[PDB]
Amino acid sequence: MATFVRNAWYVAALPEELSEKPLGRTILDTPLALYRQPDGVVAALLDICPHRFAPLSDGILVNGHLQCPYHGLEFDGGGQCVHNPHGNGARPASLNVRSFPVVERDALIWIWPGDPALADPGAIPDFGCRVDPAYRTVGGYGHVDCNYKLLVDNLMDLGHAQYVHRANAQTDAFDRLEREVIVGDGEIQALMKIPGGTPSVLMAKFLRGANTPVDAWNDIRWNKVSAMLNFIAVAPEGTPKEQSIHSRGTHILTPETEASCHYFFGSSRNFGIDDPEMDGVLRSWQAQALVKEDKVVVEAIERRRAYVEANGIRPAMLSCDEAAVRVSREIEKLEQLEAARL
Amino acid sequence: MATFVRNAWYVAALPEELSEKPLGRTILDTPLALYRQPDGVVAALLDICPHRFAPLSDGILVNGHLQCPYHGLEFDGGGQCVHNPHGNGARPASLNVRSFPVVERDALIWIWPGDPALADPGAIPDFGCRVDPAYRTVGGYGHVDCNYKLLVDNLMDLGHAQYVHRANAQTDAFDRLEREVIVGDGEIQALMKIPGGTPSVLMAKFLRGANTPVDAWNDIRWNKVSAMLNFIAVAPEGTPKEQSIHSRGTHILTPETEASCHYFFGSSRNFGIDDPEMDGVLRSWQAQALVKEDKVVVEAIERRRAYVEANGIRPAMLSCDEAAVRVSREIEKLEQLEAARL
Amino acid sequence: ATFVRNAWYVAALPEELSEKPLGRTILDTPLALYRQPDGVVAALLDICPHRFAPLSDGILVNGHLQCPYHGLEFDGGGQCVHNPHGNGARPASLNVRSFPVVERDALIWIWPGDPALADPGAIPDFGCRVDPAYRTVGGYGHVDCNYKLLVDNLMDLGHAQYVHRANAQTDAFDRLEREVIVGDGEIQALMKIPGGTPSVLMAKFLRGANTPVDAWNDIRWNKVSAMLNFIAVAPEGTPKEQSIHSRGTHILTPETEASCHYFFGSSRNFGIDDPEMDGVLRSWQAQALVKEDKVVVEAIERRRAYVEANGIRPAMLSCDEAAVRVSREIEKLEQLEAARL
Ligand SMILES: O=C(O)c1c(Cl)ccc(Cl)c1O
Ligand SMILES: O=C(O)c1c(Cl)ccc(Cl)c1O
Ligand SMILES: O=C(O)c1c(Cl)ccc(Cl)c1O
Ligand code: FES
Ligand code: FES
Ligand code: FES
Ligand SMILES: [Co+2]
Ligand SMILES: [Co+2]
Ligand SMILES: [Co+2]
Ligand SMILES: [Co+2]
Ligand SMILES: [Co+2]
Ligand SMILES: [Co+2]
Ligand SMILES: [Co+2]
Ligand SMILES: [Co+2]
């Protein structure tokens, strides 16, 4: 296949998307059949029947077993063929289908598409806020026609806020930014404190009313490959970013093909937990910003890749590209390390 | 090199599809202009004008001659340029267009897309029942986005009936009771007799007799490349076979591209010959079996070919795959034999 | 792909440009075309130097095209005139490629190749389009065929007898008199349809006047793919040198190897104040060009794979002289350029 970092955990779906009716979805050019078994456990099988290659995702569950819609072979969550209705009903090993390591955690469905012997659920990113009773989480799914790295670049960058999300987050006090970049093992963080300018649209609706040279906060954490969690906050007194009013944003990308990807987004609130109106506001921003703004930009950039590559054009970095560049380099190393292993 | 067996007869159309208005259709990646001349004889020309390559199929007949819609060159059924309206009206040999051997027989339009010197109308499969006054034939055409071999596999197989054609073709009285596969020269037959009695709703209404147990038959014949004729029958007591209530089903495939094909189907009844109403029902059930059922499965499988090939995945055969496997091997040989020739 | 990059091509009609950028691809090169506040047209590579966003999706800010992604601003020459980030430094690496552009004869010409070779002496003459003595109407069409197929089409005005049958058929066809004049960077194909019944279309040009007449359908080709035809019809043996006519603009600009832009127009010498005659011409352009010719060339493009896979070559007729010579000139230009770099 192309260049993907297969040895890592990726989100394949949101829990609400799975049920007894299989979901067919492609991850890193690998077609998967994702479904929840009767015992509530999620299973992930290669969406290719071992017999004649029909999509198992088009089948239904029979006694908790996924049945191939073509000739009826039945499989368990581990991919073992548990029933062959033909002939003497023999089930040779050649009839088992490939099963992928899968972990449901933090209201996310994680999958390991690479070497199964190398998985290890302990390396899965921490998105605990998504199931923390102290937070209220709302979110969704989006499909985007761009290489996932373009969206990683996007999420790791604050600059476009002023233009891409013009109508929304356009701080007239964005000329006085400050951004710290922390590098760790398979982890990078861009932290920013913002003490100035009475909001505009976004934070406004999140807020109520305040003013002082020290309030806002905008941060983002990146974990190995393409899983990010941001931190959007605002508060009164010289109180730490803690005790503040904030939303931790889930922004996770999973490559589908070399030129397309899956986008799992969400907002985990610390305020208005029982307020349905805020839920709307948040979902209204996600649909606007992430689906009606960032998508348009990255999809247009993807359409220009052929030209940039055909010619020897390289990007010209600005002062605000530090975080994105470092993440980009880490992802590159991971690709090389894996290619070397091969 | 998409790999087609060019030296063989293929159905390019049903008689009802042809008239004085040319039909443009691609067979084995070869664009053809098919039309019936004023004398009623069908002609098949390469759909590429010798002059500047315009589609002759977009032209009209002028005095029984197909006129190119671009600059007016006129051709006869043999591809000879019979009129050049330009200059001195000279007609050099370079102006003739390629003509394909074509035979209208058994209410089918047969064409030889390969080496014309090797044709021979005598090798054409026998589908006499289609024009036998003792039978009533109804049928149609269907386009499918799958390599033709996937549909050949399908037609040569009885095991998916229960799941794909779920009920209409379902029969718990089908089980698995000895399927005889006879291999000939350019012909293969899969014979299956089911002593138990379970006649379709249509044929049962003809058993009459005087209350008697009945046997049933589900046979199919395959001829060189991809032309099949099945035998669905039922009869009482000492069930002979040729004196039973039956339908001979025409199921012929013709490759369009490497990943698409033409499907010509039909039913030749031996019962209810004077039931125009029954005509619509039988054609509708075949259309349903193709469009809403077999098509969905084979097109999904075609969508998985890239992955299976990129990886080294081979199919895992079951007890019920004997007939399909043998036909598949015969087609393979034919490809090799032809590849060896040139 | 094989394109002759060192030549002027029409990238748009003036009416298509404004302060809102137009994104259009020419010879596989994405362009951002727009008219600055001073009225001057600019043509920039539609790829921001920073992170490659389409500048054509941006808006003008103080006469400067602003990238919609992170706000870099550029002038008509591609110079980055404003960087809102950091210390606002503007290193040379931030400038975007600008293409030589000339607005002339109600056409927007662009040089997509080596900018140092842009030789304006080569911009074709289409003066009739802005000559107050003529009335011009026209439009744009996108076609899914290699541009050379449409060049062949336009250089064979004879196809009108069949392709444009319902409007161009003539009974005096077998009496045609065609000649081919070759010259320095220019080729002309002349056609004369002697004293015959005016064609349906020529009838309209003559407000329904079915009386013996002489017809003319000439065409001029200039370096690469810019053509201007001459459709005239006049009584008995009157001279065409001074007749009722229409000079047809037929210019093609490759988009990709298998697609192109078609800029067409009609510059009348009659019924200048007759809007119904405008409709007659627009109708013809919509039917014949955007439909009739398109249907034919698009079908031919669909057969290229087969013809090439096999070793099929076209069989030329007596009426192919002009098209063949133009085809050979274009070939030479490709070779000359391939030889250069
Ligand atoms: O989608 C988010 O997590 C988000 C929100 Cl809720 C508010 C503001 C910004 Cl700049 C965001 O990126
Ligand atoms: O499609 C057919 O030829 C057919 C018919 Cl008409 C009746 C019953 C069965 Cl089981 C068939 O496979
Ligand atoms: O659009 C044109 O220039 C044209 C007209 Cl008006 C009449 C006939 C032909 Cl063949 C043309 O190409
Ligand atoms: S393809 Fe799955 S049982 Fe046959
Ligand atoms: S392409 Fe057929 S006559 Fe010219
Ligand atoms: S991509 Fe244009 S300013 Fe960033
Ligand atoms: Co079980
Ligand atoms: Co069983
Ligand atoms: Co079986
Ligand atoms: Co954004
Ligand atoms: Co004849
Ligand atoms: Co079937
Ligand atoms: Co300025
Ligand atoms: Co034309």
Side-chain angles (χ1 to χ4, degrees):
Chain A
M1 66 186 78
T3 55
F4 291 130
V5 176
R6 303 194 67 77
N7 299 327
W9 292 100
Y10 290 83
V11 173
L14 293 179
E16 55 266 45
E17 297 184 287
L18 307 187
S19 60
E20 296 196 4
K21 184 180 182 182
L23 165 66
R25 187 122 87 196
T26 293
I27 298 298
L28 312 221
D29 281 320
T30 308
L32 301 177
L34 310 164
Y35 66 99
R36 182 174 275 86
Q37 306 173 82
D39 62 1
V41 183
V42 167
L45 311 179
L46 181 62
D47 199 16
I48 299 176
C49 184
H51 179 215
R52 281 179 180 280
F53 312 152
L56 299 177
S57 59
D58 282 344
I60 59 178
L61 264 47
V62 170
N63 293 305
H65 308 137
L66 181 52
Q67 177 195 63
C68 177
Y70 204 171
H71 309 88
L73 290 186
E74 301 173 12
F75 308 85
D76 62 40
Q80 178 176 56
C81 177
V82 295
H83 185 219
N84 169 12
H86 309 286
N88 66 303
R91 303 184 304 279
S94 55
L95 298 185
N96 306 305
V97 65
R98 177 178 178 181
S99 183
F100 298 73
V102 54
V103 175
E104 178 169 15
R105 180 183 298 177
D106 300 330
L108 294 174
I109 301 305
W110 295 94
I111 297 193
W112 183 277
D115 192 316
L118 303 178
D120 176 27
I124 293 176
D126 178 18
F127 281 78
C129 63
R130 295 173 58 79
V131 296
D132 182 320
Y135 287 77
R136 166 55 177 170
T137 297
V138 301
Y141 165 82
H143 174 83
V144 185
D145 283 299
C146 74
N147 172 285
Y148 79 115
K149 292 186 288 192
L150 293 180
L151 270 179
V152 170
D153 286 335
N154 185 271
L155 296 166
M156 288 300 97
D157 167 273
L158 305 171
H160 63 277
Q162 302 300 97
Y163 314 85
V164 176
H165 310 305
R166 182 88 61 171
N168 297 301
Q170 187 174 183
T171 302
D172 58 357
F174 105 97
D175 194 2
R176 278 191 166 181
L177 301 182
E178 302 166 293
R179 206 181 201 191
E180 288 293 305
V181 176
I182 305 172
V183 187
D185 186 308
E187 183 175 299
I188 295 179
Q189 294 200 58
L191 315 181
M192 177 165 78
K193 335 299 176 178
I194 304 177
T198 198
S200 61
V201 180
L202 274 179
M203 182 180 274
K205 289 167 286 193
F206 288 50
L207 275 170
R208 278 287 185 175
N211 269 165
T212 278
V214 51
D215 298 65
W217 281 290
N218 190 315
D219 308 324
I220 190 159
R221 177 200 75 190
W222 167 85
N223 277 305
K224 189 165 181 175
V225 177
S226 53
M228 293 150 284
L229 179 66
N230 72 13
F231 181 73
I232 308 300
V234 66
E237 297 175 66
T239 52
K241 57 181 181 181
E242 183 47 62
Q243 316 296 297
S244 71
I245 298 174
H246 60 269
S247 170
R248 294 179 186 289
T250 299
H251 294 276
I252 303 173
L253 304 162
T254 297
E256 177 187 58
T257 61
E258 179 62 35
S260 60
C261 66
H262 301 290
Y263 190 178
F264 304 89
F265 59 83
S267 169
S268 296
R269 291 202 305 286
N270 177 53
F271 60 91
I273 292 178
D274 303 295
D275 172 44
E277 295 310 300
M278 190 53 74
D279 283 1
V281 186
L282 302 177
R283 281 163 172 153
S284 289
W285 152 260
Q286 305 182 311
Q288 179 80 56
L290 303 313
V291 187
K292 224 302 189 62
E293 292 169 351
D294 286 319
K295 178 175 178 183
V296 177
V297 178
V298 296
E299 296 202 315
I301 293 178
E302 187 61 43
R303 288 197 286 282
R304 285 158 178 65
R305 182 185 306 286
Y307 186 92
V308 300
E309 295 183 3
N311 294 276
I313 304 181
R314 302 182 187 179
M317 300 297 96
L318 304 179
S319 62
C320 56
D321 292 305
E322 204 192 317
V325 173
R326 286 177 180 177
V327 164
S328 180
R329 295 181 178 175
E330 288 311 304
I331 292 177
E332 178 184 61
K333 297 183 184 180
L334 294 170
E335 305 180 316
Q336 309 181 309
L337 297 179
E338 213 173 79
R341 175 162 295 180
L342 191 171
Chain B
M1 188 184 96
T3 60
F4 291 129
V5 175
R6 306 196 64 82
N7 300 326
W9 293 99
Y10 291 86
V11 170
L14 295 177
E16 55 267 43
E17 294 184 287
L18 306 189
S19 61
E20 294 196 5
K21 185 182 182 183
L23 165 65
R25 185 123 85 196
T26 292
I27 298 301
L28 313 222
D29 280 321
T30 307
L32 301 176
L34 308 167
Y35 66 99
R36 181 173 276 88
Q37 305 172 84
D39 61 3
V41 182
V42 164
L45 313 181
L46 182 60
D47 203 12
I48 300 178
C49 184
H51 180 218
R52 280 180 181 283
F53 311 152
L56 299 177
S57 62
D58 281 346
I60 61 179
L61 264 47
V62 171
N63 294 306
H65 309 135
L66 181 49
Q67 175 193 65
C68 176
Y70 205 175
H71 309 90
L73 291 183
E74 301 175 11
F75 308 84
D76 62 40
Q80 179 176 56
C81 176
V82 294
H83 183 221
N84 168 15
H86 309 290
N88 68 301
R91 304 186 303 281
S94 58
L95 296 188
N96 305 305
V97 63
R98 178 178 178 180
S99 183
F100 296 75
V102 54
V103 176
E104 177 168 16
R105 179 184 299 178
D106 301 329
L108 294 173
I109 302 304
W110 295 95
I111 295 196
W112 183 280
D115 191 318
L118 302 179
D120 179 24
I124 294 174
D126 178 14
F127 280 79
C129 62
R130 294 174 59 80
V131 295
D132 184 324
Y135 288 79
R136 166 54 176 170
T137 297
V138 297
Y141 166 82
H143 175 81
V144 183
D145 283 303
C146 78
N147 174 283
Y148 78 115
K149 291 185 288 195
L150 293 182
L151 273 178
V152 171
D153 288 335
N154 185 278
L155 296 165
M156 290 301 99
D157 168 271
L158 295 167
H160 70 288
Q162 191 183 335
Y163 314 97
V164 177
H165 308 304
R166 237 152 178 170
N168 184 58
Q170 197 182 195
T171 294
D172 59 302
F174 164 62
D175 188 6
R176 186 268 186 174
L177 313 71
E178 320 170 67
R179 189 181 199 193
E180 198 191 322
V181 174
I182 305 172
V183 179
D185 194 312
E187 179 173 302
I188 295 178
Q189 292 203 57
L191 310 178
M192 185 76 104
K193 186 173 67 60
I194 312 178
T198 301
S200 67
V201 179
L202 288 177
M203 297 185 265
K205 186 61 179 182
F206 295 79
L207 285 176
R208 175 187 167 296
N211 296 181
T212 300
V214 306
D215 292 73
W217 290 277
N218 184 312
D219 307 323
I220 192 165
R221 176 198 74 187
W222 167 84
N223 277 306
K224 188 165 181 172
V225 177
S226 49
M228 292 149 282
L229 179 64
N230 71 14
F231 182 72
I232 308 299
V234 67
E237 64 164 69
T239 56
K241 190 175 187 177
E242 292 303 299
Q243 306 307 310
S244 59
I245 300 174
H246 61 268
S247 172
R248 293 179 187 289
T250 299
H251 294 277
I252 304 174
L253 303 160
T254 297
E256 178 187 54
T257 62
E258 180 62 32
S260 60
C261 61
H262 301 290
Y263 189 176
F264 303 89
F265 60 86
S267 173
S268 293
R269 292 203 303 288
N270 178 53
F271 60 89
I273 291 178
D274 301 297
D275 198 323
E277 198 179 10
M278 191 154 84
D279 284 346
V281 173
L282 285 177
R283 181 187 190 299
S284 79
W285 281 107
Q286 289 199 299
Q288 166 62 43
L290 157 53
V291 181
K292 303 295 183 53
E293 298 170 351
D294 283 323
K295 178 175 179 181
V296 178
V297 178
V298 295
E299 299 195 322
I301 291 177
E302 187 62 43
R303 288 197 286 280
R304 285 158 178 66
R305 184 184 303 286
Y307 185 93
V308 302
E309 293 181 1
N311 292 276
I313 305 180
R314 302 181 187 179
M317 301 295 93
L318 304 178
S319 63
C320 52
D321 292 306
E322 203 191 317
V325 172
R326 286 176 180 178
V327 163
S328 178
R329 293 182 179 176
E330 289 310 307
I331 291 176
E332 180 183 58
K333 296 183 183 178
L334 293 171
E335 304 179 319
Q336 309 180 312
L337 296 179
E338 213 172 81
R341 175 162 296 179
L342 293 174
Chain C
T2 56
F3 292 129
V4 175
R5 304 193 67 79
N6 300 325
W8 295 96
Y9 292 84
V10 170
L13 296 177
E15 57 266 43
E16 298 184 285
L17 308 189
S18 62
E19 294 197 5
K20 183 182 184 181
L22 166 66
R24 185 124 84 196
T25 293
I26 297 298
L27 316 218
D28 279 320
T29 307
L31 298 176
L33 309 164
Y34 67 100
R35 180 176 275 85
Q36 307 173 83
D38 61 2
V40 182
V41 165
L44 312 176
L45 180 65
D46 200 14
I47 298 176
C48 182
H50 178 215
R51 283 182 177 279
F52 312 154
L55 298 177
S56 63
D57 284 346
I59 60 180
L60 263 47
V61 171
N62 294 305
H64 308 140
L65 182 49
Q66 174 195 68
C67 175
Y69 205 174
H70 308 94
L72 290 183
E73 302 177 11
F74 310 82
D75 62 38
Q79 176 176 56
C80 178
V81 294
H82 183 219
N83 168 12
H85 308 289
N87 67 302
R90 305 186 302 281
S93 56
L94 298 188
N95 303 308
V96 64
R97 181 178 175 180
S98 183
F99 298 73
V101 52
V102 175
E103 174 168 18
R104 180 183 299 176
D105 297 328
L107 292 177
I108 301 307
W109 295 94
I110 295 195
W111 184 277
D114 193 320
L117 299 180
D119 178 317
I123 295 183
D125 177 19
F126 281 79
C128 64
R129 295 172 58 78
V130 295
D131 182 319
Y134 288 78
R135 167 53 178 170
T136 296
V137 301
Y140 165 82
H142 174 82
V143 184
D144 283 302
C145 78
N146 174 285
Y147 79 114
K148 289 186 289 194
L149 290 185
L150 273 178
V151 172
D152 289 330
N153 182 269
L154 296 164
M155 292 299 89
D156 168 272
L157 295 187
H159 73 284
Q161 263 303 72
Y162 307 84
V163 179
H164 309 306
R165 204 165 311 199
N167 287 155
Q169 192 180 66
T170 302
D171 50 355
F173 186 53
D174 181 284
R175 297 187 298 173
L176 298 192
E177 303 183 306
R178 58 165 68 277
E179 305 299 299
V180 175
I181 304 172
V182 181
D184 200 1
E186 176 176 300
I187 297 178
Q188 292 204 55
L190 311 172
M191 291 176 64
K192 286 195 172 190
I193 312 186
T197 296
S199 174
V200 170
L201 186 61
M202 295 303 92
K204 306 186 175 185
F205 282 25
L206 301 173
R207 301 180 191 299
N210 294 181
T211 307
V213 79
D214 289 350
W216 294 279
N217 298 306
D218 305 326
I219 193 160
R220 178 200 72 189
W221 168 84
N222 278 304
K223 190 165 181 176
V224 176
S225 55
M227 291 149 285
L228 180 66
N229 72 12
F230 182 73
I231 308 300
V233 68
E236 200 182 70
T238 69
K240 66 175 179 180
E241 307 180 71
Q242 201 296 295
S243 67
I244 299 172
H245 61 271
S246 173
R247 295 179 185 288
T249 297
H250 293 281
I251 302 173
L252 304 161
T253 297
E255 178 187 53
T256 61
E257 181 60 36
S259 60
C260 63
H261 300 292
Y262 190 177
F263 302 92
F264 58 84
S266 168
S267 295
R268 291 204 304 290
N269 178 53
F270 61 90
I272 292 179
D273 304 294
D274 184 336
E276 305 313 304
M277 193 55 91
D278 278 352
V280 174
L281 286 165
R282 289 185 182 291
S283 294
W284 160 271
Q285 306 180 325
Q287 195 75 294
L289 285 42
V290 188
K291 226 181 197 61
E292 294 169 350
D293 286 319
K294 180 176 178 180
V295 175
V296 177
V297 295
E298 298 201 318
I300 292 181
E301 187 63 46
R302 289 196 284 281
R303 286 157 176 64
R304 185 184 301 289
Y306 186 91
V307 302
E308 293 182 1
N310 293 277
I312 305 179
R313 303 183 188 178
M316 299 295 96
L317 303 179
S318 65
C319 56
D320 292 303
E321 203 192 316
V324 171
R325 286 175 180 178
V326 166
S327 182
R328 295 182 178 174
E329 289 311 307
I330 292 177
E331 180 182 59
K332 298 182 181 180
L333 294 170
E334 305 179 319
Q335 308 180 310
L336 297 179
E337 212 171 82
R340 173 165 297 179
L341 68 175

